[PDB]
Design a protein around this motif. Structure first.
Motif, PDB file in Angstrom:
ATOM      1  N   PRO B 144       0.791  -1.229   0.000  1.00 13.38           N
ATOM      2  CA  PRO B 144       0.000   0.000   0.000  1.00 13.38           C
ATOM      3  C   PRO B 144       0.821   1.275   0.000  1.00 13.38           C
ATOM      4  O   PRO B 144       1.965   1.291   0.445  1.00 13.38           O
ATOM      5  CB  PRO B 144      -0.795  -0.097   1.303  1.00 13.38           C
ATOM      6  CG  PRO B 144      -0.325  -1.398   1.974  1.00 13.38           C
ATOM      7  CD  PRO B 144       0.995  -1.699   1.375  1.00 13.38           C
ATOM      8  N   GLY B 145       0.183   2.362  -0.419  1.00 10.97           N
ATOM      9  CA  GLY B 145       0.832   3.656  -0.455  1.00 10.97           C
ATOM     10  C   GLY B 145      -0.144   4.777  -0.771  1.00 10.97           C
ATOM     11  O   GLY B 145      -1.106   4.625  -1.536  1.00 10.97           O
ATOM     12  N   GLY B 146       0.153   5.934  -0.199  1.00 12.69           N
ATOM     13  CA  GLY B 146      -0.674   7.110  -0.376  1.00 12.69           C
ATOM     14  C   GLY B 146      -0.749   7.739   0.998  1.00 12.69           C
ATOM     15  O   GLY B 146       0.144   7.552   1.837  1.00 12.69           O
ATOM     16  N   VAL B 150      -5.242   7.296   5.698  1.00 15.75           N
ATOM     17  CA  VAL B 150      -6.040   6.134   5.314  1.00 15.75           C
ATOM     18  C   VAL B 150      -5.480   4.861   5.912  1.00 15.75           C
ATOM     19  O   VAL B 150      -6.201   4.101   6.550  1.00 15.75           O
ATOM     20  CB  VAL B 150      -6.177   5.969   3.770  1.00 15.75           C
ATOM     21  CG1 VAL B 150      -6.549   7.267   3.120  1.00 15.75           C
ATOM     22  CG2 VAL B 150      -4.920   5.429   3.162  1.00 15.75           C
ATOM     23  N   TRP B 151      -4.179   4.674   5.773  1.00 16.95           N
ATOM     24  CA  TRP B 151      -3.513   3.494   6.298  1.00 16.95           C
ATOM     25  C   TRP B 151      -3.975   3.051   7.676  1.00 16.95           C
ATOM     26  O   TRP B 151      -4.482   1.954   7.834  1.00 16.95           O
ATOM     27  CB  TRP B 151      -2.006   3.722   6.354  1.00 16.95           C
ATOM     28  CG  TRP B 151      -1.253   2.623   7.055  1.00 16.95           C
ATOM     29  CD1 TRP B 151      -0.376   2.759   8.103  1.00 16.95           C
ATOM     30  CD2 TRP B 151      -1.255   1.236   6.706  1.00 16.95           C
ATOM     31  NE1 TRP B 151       0.182   1.534   8.413  1.00 16.95           N
ATOM     32  CE2 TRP B 151      -0.342   0.586   7.572  1.00 16.95           C
ATOM     33  CE3 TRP B 151      -1.930   0.484   5.742  1.00 16.95           C
ATOM     34  CZ2 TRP B 151      -0.092  -0.784   7.491  1.00 16.95           C
ATOM     35  CZ3 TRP B 151      -1.681  -0.867   5.663  1.00 16.95           C
ATOM     36  CH2 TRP B 151      -0.769  -1.489   6.532  1.00 16.95           C
ATOM     37  N   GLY B 176       4.985   4.371   1.450  1.00 14.61           N
ATOM     38  CA  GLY B 176       5.333   5.744   1.163  1.00 14.61           C
ATOM     39  C   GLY B 176       4.071   6.414   0.685  1.00 14.61           C
ATOM     40  O   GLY B 176       2.984   5.871   0.878  1.00 14.61           O
ATOM     41  N   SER B 177       4.176   7.558   0.028  1.00 11.57           N
ATOM     42  CA  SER B 177       2.967   8.214  -0.443  1.00 11.57           C
ATOM     43  C   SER B 177       2.594   7.858  -1.898  1.00 11.57           C
ATOM     44  O   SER B 177       3.181   6.977  -2.513  1.00 11.57           O
ATOM     45  CB  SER B 177       3.109   9.727  -0.287  1.00 11.57           C
ATOM     46  OG  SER B 177       4.194  10.179  -1.063  1.00 11.57           O
ATOM     47  N   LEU B 359      10.055   5.988   1.242  1.00 11.77           N
ATOM     48  CA  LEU B 359      10.007   4.534   1.422  1.00 11.77           C
ATOM     49  C   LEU B 359      11.062   3.962   2.400  1.00 11.77           C
ATOM     50  O   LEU B 359      12.202   4.418   2.430  1.00 11.77           O
ATOM     51  CB  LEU B 359      10.107   3.896   0.021  1.00 11.77           C
ATOM     52  CG  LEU B 359      10.238   2.408  -0.317  1.00 11.77           C
ATOM     53  CD1 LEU B 359       9.697   2.151  -1.723  1.00 11.77           C
ATOM     54  CD2 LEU B 359      11.704   1.976  -0.219  1.00 11.77           C
ATOM     55  N   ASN B 360      10.654   3.034   3.260  1.00  5.96           N
ATOM     56  CA  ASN B 360      11.588   2.409   4.186  1.00  5.96           C
ATOM     57  C   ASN B 360      11.827   1.000   3.674  1.00  5.96           C
ATOM     58  O   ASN B 360      11.073   0.053   3.947  1.00  5.96           O
ATOM     59  CB  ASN B 360      11.087   2.383   5.635  1.00  5.96           C
ATOM     60  CG  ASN B 360      12.214   2.018   6.643  1.00  5.96           C
ATOM     61  OD1 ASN B 360      12.963   2.896   7.125  1.00  5.96           O
ATOM     62  ND2 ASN B 360      12.335   0.722   6.960  1.00  5.96           N
TER      63      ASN B 360
END
Lengths: 478, 478
Positions: B144-146, B150-151, B176-177, B359-360
């Motif tokens: 997932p991302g954004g 929301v997460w 990440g986003s 990002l990790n």
């Protein structure tokens, strides 16, 4: 009244103008920084044809000097500046005039610029130019695409400045509609990349095998005399290898190993991938450059794992062009280069089917024979092959003989380079795979991967005996 | 009220639905042809959690039943199909709700959608999912991302449904986003392509060396027990190899050698090329499939040049996994596979900095350990490696030992296969070049090519001794 106007005094723009001036046409010239126009007129004040060179200040003045319909070759190497220049022009120009972008951007952009413009009254033409500095001044190759009628107007000016092949034909020809010309230039630059990398590998390989810069050159020179590989790129490689520094040492040893690029190659790779035609050599040519650009990373990896790449080596007993292995390399290169051309043409052929340019392949290839960087002996039989049978499955068929003769040598040479030498051969390697894969009716790995996709994705697979897709009932694996 | 909604009941939709409702959540269902939902609730009406499933009429209804903020997971076919669906929802939802796209979009589209929607007062999440049909049901990996917002609102449902790796950690993490999640999934699919191809090549090679379908299986079988290569893809390769047709023969022999593709692999290749990161194995993986789709051409080429690829051949003495040759083939694959993952991860590393995802990596690479197609033993040490030193130059160093040991074996095998076998090995080949090239501080071919570009284009070149760019003076060549 000027016959033609040339916009942008770069490496090409200035030389081209002169070329056309010397051919006797009056050419209005124009640059962004008027100052450059001055320096230009200066260095060429004494030329015998300096009377055909009218420099200008303002676009609006420049536009009035041209015989309606104006004709402006936009020689400003850009992407953005080209659109900016097109705006300047578009305003000071009249309904009917011509704008020829000799630019070097994606054929897709040309399809745009053209389309807007015709609906705005001006006529467009995307046209490529290859030859470099010398080619521009002496006679390059052009690759036009765009309005069929627009060509006839411009034909005289370009046919005169084009390079002439050994048959008196000018290396220019209408390739078809829209971005057809820019597409051809793109793929041209694509094959250029693969070939330059092939020579570069040869250098690396021979150096690894013990030859010094001079000894390498002698084999290139010997290969040049054997005729088949006679080409411009070969000539420049020889120059490149013999070149010497101020301190009397080989230039190559002082050269930072990072290869810059400007995109033509990158895009051709992406579109080839897009439309789906296999072109391994064309891709790995770009990847090979990407390898160099990561100088910093490569240096770090090296430190972390000192001499991990170490091999047994192989020092040549016979450093002469007649040596057995050097003859093995020769054949490798011949075939490798042939496959580069093959892929390049297959991409073009496919690109025509898809974008419907109405490309006349044998007419286009014929214009590769001189002026452009891809020129060389091989272009003669390749032109004839596509003239003889225009629907040939693939270009390599025409060379079935040459290929059979050296294929094993090609196989042995890379086998030896792989196990014994400490050198990366991206392109020489990808090319052999292209040859082997393309002449193989059944690729077994395709049977396995095809099934695999069904196992997890239930995508199904085609069968050779039924019709339609089939999907196997697989046992649980988790 | 309903816990969460699902739209689209493909191979993935249905299974994930059941996956979720089984875990204790009420799940609203929707689809285009209400027939399909009927057939869904139909076949699954006896399931002990059916009461946590409800098929719906219209989006009016579907959006009606959901606990606010509405959370929807779109599970339809990528492209225009998704576009439409998001539009329908858009009407029937309200400020703050959440749209979670999970159907394979090019990461650039998600980033756009995110904004569109964010400016319209809704939240979006691009969320890749992998594992296939079975994985969708038993618990896959999610990328997932954004918006972080929301997460944390969705974290429960996705954690509870995702596969859990050894340490019990679930294979989900906020990547990440924007399109960070879809990017990861794109590159995950890219590594998948390369590795599937590697197994496919192994099949081809051993078949060429004389092993029958059952004997290669035994080799893979032994390779599995050696543990290092234990992986999902290995398992399915074994199934694929063992599979038999109704006529009691091997399935592979009736399989049409054409590998379909659906894009994710293609784009990963194009963006890797775009940002400039070297990924030869990811690039040739797509090409190798391209080779297979040109079955017709390959067949024609073969007719016009019969027996052209004819080679000496090489039949094995022992078809037993203890065979020395089989042993080097092992080292080859091990190393090949390691570079595949390496390339994949470098792509993400650069992708992140260019596109600023935040990002990790170590968190991300950890979620690859189970549930997804790329799952296997290797992901364990690899994960450690990045937890240990987050800014390690290239993952390959963490595997310096194994590389040092099998490298010559890898070279000799490829040398052998090239010289004697009538098979193409696109990816086994490119991967070896990736390794040798990336550990080499000075690539000499870069010196020649660099100078070559100067000769004709006057582009100049960087010196290793001066700083800045220099340009030589060359003899006329035409």
């Amino acid at each position: 009244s000027m016959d033609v106007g040339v916009v942008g005094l770069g490496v090409m723009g200035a030389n081209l103008a002169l070329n056309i001036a010397e051919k006797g046409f009056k050419v209005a010239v124009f640059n962004r920084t008027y100052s450059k126009s001055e320096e230009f007129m200066k260095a060429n004040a004494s030329a015998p044809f300096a009377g055909n060179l009218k420099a200008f200040e303002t676009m609006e003045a420049f536009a009035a000097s041209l015989k309606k319909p104006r004709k402006a070759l936009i020689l400003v190497q850009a992407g953005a500046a080209t659109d900016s220049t097109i705006e300047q022009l578009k305003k000071v120009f009249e309904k009917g005039d011509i704008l020829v972008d000799t630019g070097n951007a994606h054929f897709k952009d040309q399809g745009r610029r053209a389309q807007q413009l015709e609906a705005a009254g001006l006529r467009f033409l995307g046209m490529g130019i290859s030859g470099g500095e010398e080619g521009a001044r002496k006679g390059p190759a052009f690759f036009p695409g765009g309005t069929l009628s627009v060509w006839e107007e411009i034909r005289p000016i370009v046919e005169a400045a084009a390079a002439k092949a050994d048959d008196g034909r000018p290396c220019v020809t209408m390739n078809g509609s829209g971005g057809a010309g820019s597409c051809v230039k793109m793929y041209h630059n694509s094959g250029e990349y693969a070939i330059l990398q092939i020579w570069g590998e040869v250098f690396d390989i021979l150096r690894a095998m013990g030859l010094n810069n001079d000894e390498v050159a002698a084999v290139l020179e010997d290969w040049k005399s054997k005729n088949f590989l006679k080409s411009y790129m070969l000539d420049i490689s020889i120059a490149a290898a013999r070149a010497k520094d101020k301190d009397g040492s080989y230039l190559t040893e002082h050269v930072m190993d990072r290869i810059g690029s400007k995109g033509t190659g990158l895009w051709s790779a992406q579109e080839a991938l897009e439309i789906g035609v296999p072109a391994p050599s064309l891709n790995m040519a770009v990847v090979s450059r990407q390898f160099t650009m990561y100088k910093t990373e490569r240096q770090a990896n090296a430190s972390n794992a000192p001499g991990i790449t170490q091999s047994p080596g192989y020092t040549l007993k016979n450093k002469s062009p007649s040596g057995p292995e050097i003859k093995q390399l020769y054949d490798s290169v011949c075939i490798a280069i042939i496959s580069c051309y093959a892929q390049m043409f297959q991409c073009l052929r496919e690109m025509d089917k898809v974008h419907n340019f109405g490309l006349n392949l044998p007419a286009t290839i014929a214009t590769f024979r001189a002026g452009c960087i891809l020129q060389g002996y091989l272009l003669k039989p390749m032109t004839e092959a596509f003239e003889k049978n225009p629907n040939i499955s693939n270009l390599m068929c025409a060379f079935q003989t040459e290929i059979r003769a050296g294929l094993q040598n090609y196989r042995d040479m890379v086998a030896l380079i792989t196990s014994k030498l400490e050198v990366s051969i991206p392109v020489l390697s990808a090319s052999l795979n292209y040859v082997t894969a393309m002449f193989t009716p059944t690729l077994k790995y395709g049977q396995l991967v095809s099934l695999q996709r069904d196992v997890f994705g239930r995508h199904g697979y085609e069968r050779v005996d039924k019709d339609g897709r089939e999907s196997f009932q697989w046992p649980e694996l988790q």
